Amino acid sequence: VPFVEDWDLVQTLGEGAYGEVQLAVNRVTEEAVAVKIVDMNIKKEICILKMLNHENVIKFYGHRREGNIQYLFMELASGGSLFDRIEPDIGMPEPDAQRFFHQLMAGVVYLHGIGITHRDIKPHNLLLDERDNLKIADYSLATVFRYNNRERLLNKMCGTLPYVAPELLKRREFHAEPVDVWSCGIVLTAMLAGELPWDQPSDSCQEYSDWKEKKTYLNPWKKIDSAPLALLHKILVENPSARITIPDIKKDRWYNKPLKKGAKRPRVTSGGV
Ligand SMILES: [Cl-]
């Protein structure tokens, strides 16, 4: 029974470090949206949020301040997270993984093309609409890495250790785009194996050492077919300047492999075939 202007906040979708996220339903129009509620940087988030316009990125509808609390209205992805579609120790069917990977690259290319890096790509932040279309959500760590056609290097460490690229832990400053690419590879690994390969990509983490030594008889690699594994070998490359870029991902054999049948034709409601 809480509400904001014309919307009722009817269900808690999740929780933030500084927020809560609610299902908001418009009393008049019946539209359903998501609303992130922040008690009391968020100015920066809003500027980035207003830039977003792409089918694989959560759209921003506007905001409201009421005393101490900010409300950020956002497109709803009613299917929830990709995280909940990954069966532990299994993953998901390869054709479904490929499709989600396709969508994820489309959203990341978009963001990179407007000079925005998300910086915390992981299945928890990849939401699904009612047709299972992927949407990159939560721009609270996002930042500008290109402005007026000039790249800036990053230096703040942030993200989530099992998804983070090794340069982020090793270098004083690093390029944004390869970091996002690396985390897309860890997502792909999770979709195909239902398990993360390492706690973190550091020289003191055995499982990472094992990967650099190509011990792909170990989990999770041994669960992964040779084609997508060859892509993962190009993505999960320690040196960020040697790592595959998105233009080249789009040329990869597995990325271009036909795997998934299209949806059945929609039901006739009027007229003929
Ligand atoms: Cl996992």
Short mmCIF file of N, CA and C in Angstrom, two decimals, residues 59-207:
data_model
loop_
_atom_site.label_atom_id
_atom_site.label_comp_id
_atom_site.label_asym_id
_atom_site.label_seq_id
_atom_site.Cartn_x
_atom_site.Cartn_y
_atom_site.Cartn_z
N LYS A 59 15.36 0.59 -20.06
CA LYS A 59 15.09 2.05 -20.31
C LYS A 59 14.73 2.78 -19.05
N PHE A 60 15.07 4.08 -19.00
CA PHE A 60 14.75 4.96 -17.87
C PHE A 60 13.56 5.83 -18.26
N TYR A 61 12.57 5.92 -17.38
CA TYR A 61 11.36 6.69 -17.65
C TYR A 61 11.35 8.07 -16.96
N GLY A 62 12.05 8.24 -15.84
CA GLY A 62 12.15 9.55 -15.23
C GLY A 62 12.36 9.38 -13.75
N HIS A 63 12.40 10.47 -13.05
CA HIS A 63 12.57 10.35 -11.60
C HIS A 63 11.81 11.38 -10.82
N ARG A 64 11.69 11.12 -9.53
CA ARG A 64 10.99 11.98 -8.57
C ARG A 64 11.74 12.03 -7.23
N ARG A 65 11.88 13.22 -6.65
CA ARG A 65 12.46 13.35 -5.31
C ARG A 65 11.31 13.75 -4.40
N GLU A 66 11.16 13.08 -3.27
CA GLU A 66 10.14 13.45 -2.31
C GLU A 66 10.85 13.50 -0.99
N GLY A 67 11.27 14.71 -0.61
CA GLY A 67 12.05 14.89 0.61
C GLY A 67 13.41 14.20 0.53
N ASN A 68 13.63 13.17 1.35
CA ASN A 68 14.89 12.39 1.39
C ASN A 68 15.01 11.25 0.34
N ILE A 69 13.92 10.95 -0.37
CA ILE A 69 13.90 9.73 -1.16
C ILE A 69 13.78 10.01 -2.65
N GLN A 70 14.66 9.36 -3.41
CA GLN A 70 14.61 9.47 -4.87
C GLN A 70 13.96 8.22 -5.41
N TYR A 71 13.19 8.40 -6.46
CA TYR A 71 12.55 7.29 -7.15
C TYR A 71 13.03 7.28 -8.59
N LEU A 72 13.54 6.15 -9.07
CA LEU A 72 13.99 6.08 -10.45
C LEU A 72 13.10 5.07 -11.15
N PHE A 73 12.35 5.53 -12.15
CA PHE A 73 11.39 4.72 -12.84
C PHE A 73 12.07 4.11 -14.05
N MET A 74 11.92 2.80 -14.20
CA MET A 74 12.62 2.01 -15.20
C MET A 74 11.77 0.94 -15.82
N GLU A 75 12.13 0.57 -17.04
CA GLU A 75 11.46 -0.47 -17.71
C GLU A 75 11.46 -1.72 -16.85
N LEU A 76 10.33 -2.41 -16.81
CA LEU A 76 10.19 -3.67 -16.12
C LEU A 76 10.60 -4.86 -17.03
N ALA A 77 11.35 -5.79 -16.45
CA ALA A 77 11.71 -7.04 -17.10
C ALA A 77 11.13 -8.14 -16.22
N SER A 78 9.92 -8.58 -16.58
CA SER A 78 9.09 -9.34 -15.66
C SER A 78 9.61 -10.73 -15.48
N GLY A 79 10.42 -11.24 -16.39
CA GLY A 79 11.06 -12.56 -16.19
C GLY A 79 12.18 -12.65 -15.17
N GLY A 80 12.63 -11.55 -14.60
CA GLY A 80 13.62 -11.59 -13.51
C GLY A 80 15.02 -11.85 -14.11
N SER A 81 15.93 -12.42 -13.33
CA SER A 81 17.31 -12.48 -13.77
C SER A 81 17.70 -13.73 -14.50
N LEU A 82 18.79 -13.56 -15.28
CA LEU A 82 19.37 -14.65 -16.02
C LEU A 82 19.96 -15.61 -15.01
N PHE A 83 20.37 -15.07 -13.88
CA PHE A 83 20.94 -15.89 -12.80
C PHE A 83 20.03 -17.07 -12.47
N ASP A 84 18.74 -16.80 -12.39
CA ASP A 84 17.76 -17.84 -12.02
C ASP A 84 17.46 -18.85 -13.14
N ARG A 85 17.95 -18.65 -14.36
CA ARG A 85 17.86 -19.62 -15.45
C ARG A 85 19.04 -20.52 -15.59
N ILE A 86 20.06 -20.33 -14.77
CA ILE A 86 21.26 -21.10 -14.85
C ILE A 86 21.13 -22.22 -13.79
N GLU A 87 21.06 -23.45 -14.23
CA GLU A 87 21.01 -24.58 -13.32
C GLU A 87 22.40 -24.89 -12.80
N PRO A 88 22.57 -24.93 -11.46
CA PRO A 88 23.90 -25.16 -10.97
C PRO A 88 24.47 -26.50 -11.41
N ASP A 89 25.75 -26.45 -11.78
CA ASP A 89 26.52 -27.53 -12.31
C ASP A 89 26.16 -27.98 -13.69
N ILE A 90 25.09 -27.43 -14.24
CA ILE A 90 24.60 -27.78 -15.59
C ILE A 90 24.72 -26.60 -16.55
N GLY A 91 24.22 -25.44 -16.16
CA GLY A 91 24.08 -24.36 -17.14
C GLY A 91 22.68 -24.27 -17.76
N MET A 92 22.62 -24.30 -19.08
CA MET A 92 21.37 -24.23 -19.79
C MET A 92 21.70 -24.75 -21.21
N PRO A 93 20.68 -25.07 -21.96
CA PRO A 93 20.92 -25.53 -23.30
C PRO A 93 21.74 -24.54 -24.12
N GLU A 94 22.72 -25.05 -24.88
CA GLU A 94 23.61 -24.20 -25.68
C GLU A 94 22.92 -23.21 -26.59
N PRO A 95 21.81 -23.61 -27.27
CA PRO A 95 21.10 -22.65 -28.12
C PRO A 95 20.53 -21.48 -27.32
N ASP A 96 20.08 -21.73 -26.08
CA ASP A 96 19.60 -20.65 -25.25
C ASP A 96 20.77 -19.75 -24.77
N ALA A 97 21.86 -20.37 -24.32
CA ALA A 97 23.04 -19.61 -24.00
C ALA A 97 23.49 -18.71 -25.16
N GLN A 98 23.50 -19.23 -26.36
CA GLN A 98 23.99 -18.48 -27.54
C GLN A 98 23.10 -17.28 -27.78
N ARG A 99 21.79 -17.49 -27.69
CA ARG A 99 20.86 -16.42 -27.91
C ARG A 99 21.06 -15.34 -26.89
N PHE A 100 21.18 -15.72 -25.60
CA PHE A 100 21.38 -14.70 -24.60
C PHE A 100 22.74 -13.94 -24.81
N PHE A 101 23.75 -14.71 -25.18
CA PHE A 101 25.06 -14.12 -25.52
C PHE A 101 24.95 -13.10 -26.68
N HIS A 102 24.18 -13.46 -27.72
CA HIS A 102 23.93 -12.54 -28.79
C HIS A 102 23.32 -11.23 -28.30
N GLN A 103 22.34 -11.33 -27.42
CA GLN A 103 21.67 -10.16 -26.91
C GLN A 103 22.56 -9.34 -26.01
N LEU A 104 23.34 -10.04 -25.21
CA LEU A 104 24.25 -9.40 -24.31
C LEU A 104 25.29 -8.62 -25.08
N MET A 105 25.84 -9.18 -26.13
CA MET A 105 26.78 -8.42 -26.97
C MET A 105 26.16 -7.21 -27.63
N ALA A 106 24.89 -7.36 -28.08
CA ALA A 106 24.19 -6.25 -28.66
C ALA A 106 24.05 -5.14 -27.67
N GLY A 107 23.71 -5.42 -26.41
CA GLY A 107 23.58 -4.36 -25.41
C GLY A 107 24.92 -3.74 -25.05
N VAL A 108 25.96 -4.57 -24.97
CA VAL A 108 27.30 -4.07 -24.61
C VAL A 108 27.88 -3.23 -25.75
N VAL A 109 27.72 -3.65 -27.00
CA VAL A 109 28.13 -2.82 -28.15
C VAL A 109 27.42 -1.48 -28.10
N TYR A 110 26.12 -1.48 -27.87
CA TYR A 110 25.39 -0.25 -27.76
C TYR A 110 26.01 0.67 -26.71
N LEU A 111 26.24 0.13 -25.51
CA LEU A 111 26.68 0.97 -24.42
C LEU A 111 28.06 1.49 -24.75
N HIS A 112 28.93 0.61 -25.22
CA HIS A 112 30.26 1.06 -25.60
C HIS A 112 30.24 2.14 -26.69
N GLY A 113 29.29 2.04 -27.59
CA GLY A 113 29.11 3.01 -28.68
C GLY A 113 28.66 4.37 -28.20
N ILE A 114 27.96 4.47 -27.07
CA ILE A 114 27.73 5.78 -26.48
C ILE A 114 28.74 6.17 -25.41
N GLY A 115 29.84 5.44 -25.31
CA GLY A 115 30.92 5.70 -24.43
C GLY A 115 30.66 5.37 -22.97
N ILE A 116 29.72 4.47 -22.71
CA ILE A 116 29.36 4.05 -21.35
C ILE A 116 29.87 2.63 -21.09
N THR A 117 30.51 2.43 -19.93
CA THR A 117 30.86 1.09 -19.47
C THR A 117 29.99 0.79 -18.23
N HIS A 118 29.45 -0.42 -18.16
CA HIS A 118 28.56 -0.87 -17.12
C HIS A 118 29.39 -1.23 -15.89
N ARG A 119 30.50 -1.92 -16.08
CA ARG A 119 31.47 -2.29 -15.04
C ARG A 119 31.08 -3.41 -14.04
N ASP A 120 29.85 -3.90 -14.11
CA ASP A 120 29.48 -5.05 -13.29
C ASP A 120 28.55 -6.03 -13.98
N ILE A 121 28.96 -6.43 -15.17
CA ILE A 121 28.23 -7.42 -15.91
C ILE A 121 28.32 -8.85 -15.29
N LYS A 122 27.16 -9.40 -14.94
CA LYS A 122 27.05 -10.69 -14.30
C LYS A 122 25.59 -11.07 -14.40
N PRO A 123 25.28 -12.34 -14.28
CA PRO A 123 23.91 -12.78 -14.53
C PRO A 123 22.84 -12.16 -13.64
N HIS A 124 23.22 -11.77 -12.43
CA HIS A 124 22.35 -11.07 -11.53
C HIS A 124 21.84 -9.75 -12.13
N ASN A 125 22.62 -9.12 -13.03
CA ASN A 125 22.30 -7.77 -13.56
C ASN A 125 21.75 -7.88 -15.00
N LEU A 126 21.47 -9.09 -15.44
CA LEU A 126 20.97 -9.32 -16.79
C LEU A 126 19.57 -9.88 -16.56
N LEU A 127 18.57 -9.09 -16.89
CA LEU A 127 17.19 -9.40 -16.63
C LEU A 127 16.50 -9.84 -17.96
N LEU A 128 15.35 -10.50 -17.86
CA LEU A 128 14.64 -11.05 -19.02
C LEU A 128 13.23 -10.48 -19.06
N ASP A 129 12.79 -10.03 -20.24
CA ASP A 129 11.42 -9.60 -20.39
C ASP A 129 10.53 -10.81 -20.55
N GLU A 130 9.26 -10.57 -20.86
CA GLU A 130 8.29 -11.69 -20.89
C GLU A 130 8.53 -12.67 -22.06
N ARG A 131 9.23 -12.20 -23.09
CA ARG A 131 9.71 -13.03 -24.19
C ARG A 131 11.18 -13.46 -24.06
N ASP A 132 11.72 -13.39 -22.84
CA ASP A 132 13.07 -13.83 -22.58
C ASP A 132 14.12 -13.01 -23.33
N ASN A 133 13.82 -11.76 -23.68
CA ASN A 133 14.81 -10.88 -24.20
C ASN A 133 15.67 -10.31 -23.00
N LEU A 134 16.98 -10.25 -23.22
CA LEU A 134 17.92 -9.87 -22.17
C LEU A 134 18.03 -8.36 -22.12
N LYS A 135 18.09 -7.86 -20.90
CA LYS A 135 18.24 -6.45 -20.64
C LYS A 135 19.31 -6.23 -19.59
N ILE A 136 20.29 -5.37 -19.90
CA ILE A 136 21.36 -5.04 -18.97
C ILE A 136 20.81 -3.96 -18.04
N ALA A 137 20.84 -4.28 -16.75
CA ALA A 137 20.22 -3.46 -15.72
C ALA A 137 21.30 -3.02 -14.67
N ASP A 138 20.97 -1.92 -13.98
CA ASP A 138 21.66 -1.39 -12.80
C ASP A 138 22.91 -0.65 -13.20
N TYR A 139 22.75 0.67 -13.34
CA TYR A 139 23.80 1.56 -13.81
C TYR A 139 24.47 2.34 -12.68
N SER A 140 24.36 1.81 -11.49
CA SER A 140 24.95 2.46 -10.35
C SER A 140 26.47 2.40 -10.33
N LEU A 141 27.13 1.49 -11.04
CA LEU A 141 28.58 1.52 -11.14
C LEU A 141 29.03 2.02 -12.49
N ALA A 142 28.09 2.34 -13.36
CA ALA A 142 28.42 2.70 -14.73
C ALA A 142 29.15 4.04 -14.82
N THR A 143 29.99 4.19 -15.83
CA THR A 143 30.69 5.47 -16.07
C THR A 143 31.05 5.71 -17.55
N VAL A 144 31.43 6.95 -17.84
CA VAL A 144 31.79 7.40 -19.13
C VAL A 144 33.22 7.06 -19.32
N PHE A 145 33.52 6.36 -20.39
CA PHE A 145 34.90 6.08 -20.75
C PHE A 145 35.25 6.70 -22.06
N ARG A 146 34.28 7.26 -22.76
CA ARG A 146 34.59 8.00 -23.99
C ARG A 146 33.70 9.20 -24.07
N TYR A 147 34.34 10.36 -24.27
CA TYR A 147 33.52 11.61 -24.40
C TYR A 147 34.15 12.51 -25.44
N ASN A 148 33.36 13.17 -26.28
CA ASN A 148 33.96 13.90 -27.41
C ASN A 148 35.02 13.12 -28.23
N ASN A 149 34.73 11.84 -28.41
CA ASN A 149 35.57 10.93 -29.13
C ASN A 149 36.95 10.68 -28.56
N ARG A 150 37.12 11.00 -27.28
CA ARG A 150 38.38 10.80 -26.58
C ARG A 150 38.17 9.78 -25.45
N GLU A 151 38.94 8.70 -25.49
CA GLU A 151 38.86 7.68 -24.47
C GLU A 151 39.52 8.15 -23.19
N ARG A 152 38.95 7.86 -22.03
CA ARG A 152 39.67 7.95 -20.76
C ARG A 152 39.89 6.56 -20.19
N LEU A 153 41.05 6.31 -19.68
CA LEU A 153 41.32 5.08 -18.96
C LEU A 153 40.62 5.10 -17.62
N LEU A 154 40.35 3.92 -17.07
CA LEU A 154 39.75 3.87 -15.74
C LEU A 154 40.81 3.59 -14.74
N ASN A 155 40.57 3.98 -13.52
CA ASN A 155 41.44 3.56 -12.43
C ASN A 155 40.75 3.05 -11.12
N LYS A 156 39.49 3.37 -10.89
CA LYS A 156 38.76 2.84 -9.73
C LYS A 156 38.57 1.34 -9.93
N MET A 157 38.85 0.54 -8.91
CA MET A 157 38.52 -0.86 -8.94
C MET A 157 37.05 -0.98 -8.49
N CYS A 158 36.24 -1.65 -9.28
CA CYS A 158 34.91 -2.05 -8.82
C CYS A 158 34.43 -3.27 -9.62
N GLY A 159 33.29 -3.81 -9.22
CA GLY A 159 32.72 -5.01 -9.84
C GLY A 159 32.66 -6.15 -8.90
N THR A 160 32.83 -7.36 -9.43
CA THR A 160 32.55 -8.54 -8.63
C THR A 160 33.61 -9.54 -8.95
N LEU A 161 34.41 -9.89 -7.96
CA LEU A 161 35.71 -10.51 -8.19
C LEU A 161 35.74 -11.71 -9.19
N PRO A 162 34.74 -12.61 -9.11
CA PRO A 162 34.78 -13.71 -10.02
C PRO A 162 34.54 -13.27 -11.48
N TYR A 163 33.98 -12.09 -11.67
CA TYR A 163 33.71 -11.60 -13.02
C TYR A 163 34.71 -10.57 -13.55
N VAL A 164 35.56 -10.06 -12.65
CA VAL A 164 36.41 -8.97 -12.94
C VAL A 164 37.62 -9.42 -13.81
N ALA A 165 38.06 -8.58 -14.74
CA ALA A 165 39.24 -8.85 -15.56
C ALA A 165 40.55 -8.69 -14.78
N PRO A 166 41.60 -9.48 -15.10
CA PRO A 166 42.82 -9.47 -14.32
C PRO A 166 43.53 -8.11 -14.28
N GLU A 167 43.46 -7.35 -15.37
CA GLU A 167 44.08 -6.02 -15.41
C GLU A 167 43.53 -5.07 -14.37
N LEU A 168 42.26 -5.24 -14.03
CA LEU A 168 41.68 -4.40 -13.05
C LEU A 168 42.34 -4.55 -11.69
N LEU A 169 42.80 -5.75 -11.39
CA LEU A 169 43.57 -6.00 -10.17
C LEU A 169 45.06 -5.69 -10.39
N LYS A 170 45.55 -5.73 -11.61
CA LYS A 170 47.01 -5.63 -11.80
C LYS A 170 47.52 -4.26 -12.23
N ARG A 171 46.74 -3.46 -12.93
CA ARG A 171 47.23 -2.25 -13.54
C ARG A 171 46.69 -1.07 -12.83
N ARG A 172 47.45 0.02 -12.82
CA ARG A 172 47.03 1.28 -12.20
C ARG A 172 45.87 1.82 -13.02
N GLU A 173 45.97 1.73 -14.33
CA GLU A 173 44.91 2.26 -15.21
C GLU A 173 44.71 1.29 -16.31
N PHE A 174 43.47 1.20 -16.79
CA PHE A 174 43.12 0.17 -17.79
C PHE A 174 41.95 0.61 -18.66
N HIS A 175 41.92 0.04 -19.86
CA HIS A 175 40.84 0.32 -20.74
C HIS A 175 39.50 -0.31 -20.26
N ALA A 176 38.42 0.41 -20.45
CA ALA A 176 37.10 -0.06 -20.05
C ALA A 176 36.57 -1.22 -20.87
N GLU A 177 36.73 -1.17 -22.21
CA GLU A 177 36.00 -2.09 -23.02
C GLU A 177 36.46 -3.58 -22.82
N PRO A 178 37.76 -3.85 -22.75
CA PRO A 178 38.15 -5.23 -22.51
C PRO A 178 37.68 -5.79 -21.14
N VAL A 179 37.46 -4.92 -20.16
CA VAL A 179 37.00 -5.37 -18.87
C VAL A 179 35.59 -5.91 -19.00
N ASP A 180 34.76 -5.19 -19.70
CA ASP A 180 33.36 -5.59 -19.96
C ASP A 180 33.33 -6.87 -20.82
N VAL A 181 34.22 -6.96 -21.80
CA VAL A 181 34.33 -8.15 -22.59
C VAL A 181 34.66 -9.43 -21.76
N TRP A 182 35.66 -9.27 -20.86
CA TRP A 182 36.00 -10.35 -19.97
C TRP A 182 34.77 -10.81 -19.15
N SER A 183 34.08 -9.90 -18.53
CA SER A 183 32.93 -10.29 -17.73
C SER A 183 31.82 -10.97 -18.58
N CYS A 184 31.68 -10.59 -19.86
CA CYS A 184 30.76 -11.30 -20.77
C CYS A 184 31.24 -12.75 -20.93
N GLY A 185 32.56 -12.98 -21.00
CA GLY A 185 33.05 -14.34 -21.08
C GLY A 185 32.78 -15.21 -19.84
N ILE A 186 32.84 -14.59 -18.68
CA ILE A 186 32.55 -15.32 -17.44
C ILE A 186 31.05 -15.62 -17.41
N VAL A 187 30.20 -14.67 -17.87
CA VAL A 187 28.80 -14.94 -17.99
C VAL A 187 28.53 -16.16 -18.94
N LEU A 188 29.24 -16.17 -20.08
CA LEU A 188 29.04 -17.24 -21.04
C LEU A 188 29.45 -18.60 -20.38
N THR A 189 30.56 -18.59 -19.62
CA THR A 189 31.00 -19.74 -18.95
C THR A 189 29.91 -20.27 -17.94
N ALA A 190 29.34 -19.39 -17.14
CA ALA A 190 28.28 -19.70 -16.26
C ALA A 190 27.07 -20.25 -16.97
N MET A 191 26.67 -19.72 -18.15
CA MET A 191 25.53 -20.20 -18.89
C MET A 191 25.78 -21.61 -19.41
N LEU A 192 27.01 -21.91 -19.77
CA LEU A 192 27.29 -23.23 -20.37
C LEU A 192 27.71 -24.30 -19.43
N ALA A 193 28.02 -23.94 -18.20
CA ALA A 193 28.54 -24.92 -17.19
C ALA A 193 27.82 -24.87 -15.84
N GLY A 194 27.10 -23.77 -15.54
CA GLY A 194 26.45 -23.57 -14.27
C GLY A 194 27.45 -23.50 -13.14
N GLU A 195 28.63 -22.99 -13.42
CA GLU A 195 29.66 -22.82 -12.42
C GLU A 195 30.69 -21.79 -12.88
N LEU A 196 31.21 -21.07 -11.91
CA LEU A 196 32.23 -20.11 -12.13
C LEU A 196 33.60 -20.77 -12.15
N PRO A 197 34.47 -20.34 -13.03
CA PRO A 197 35.79 -20.96 -13.05
C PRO A 197 36.76 -20.64 -11.92
N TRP A 198 36.68 -19.47 -11.31
CA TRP A 198 37.66 -19.07 -10.28
C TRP A 198 37.09 -18.02 -9.43
N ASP A 199 37.64 -17.93 -8.23
CA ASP A 199 37.30 -16.90 -7.30
C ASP A 199 37.72 -15.55 -7.73
N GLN A 200 38.87 -15.50 -8.40
CA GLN A 200 39.34 -14.27 -8.96
C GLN A 200 40.51 -14.55 -9.89
N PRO A 201 40.77 -13.65 -10.84
CA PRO A 201 41.78 -13.95 -11.85
C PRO A 201 43.17 -13.48 -11.40
N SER A 202 43.65 -14.05 -10.32
CA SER A 202 44.90 -13.59 -9.78
C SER A 202 45.84 -14.77 -9.86
N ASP A 203 47.10 -14.45 -9.99
CA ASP A 203 48.17 -15.45 -9.99
C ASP A 203 48.22 -16.40 -8.76
N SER A 204 47.60 -16.03 -7.65
CA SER A 204 47.52 -16.88 -6.47
C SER A 204 46.25 -17.75 -6.45
N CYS A 205 45.44 -17.70 -7.50
CA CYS A 205 44.24 -18.50 -7.56
C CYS A 205 44.53 -19.67 -8.49
N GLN A 206 44.50 -20.88 -7.92
CA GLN A 206 44.93 -22.08 -8.60
C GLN A 206 44.14 -22.32 -9.88
N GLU A 207 42.83 -22.10 -9.78
CA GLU A 207 41.96 -22.39 -10.88
C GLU A 207 42.25 -21.48 -12.06
#
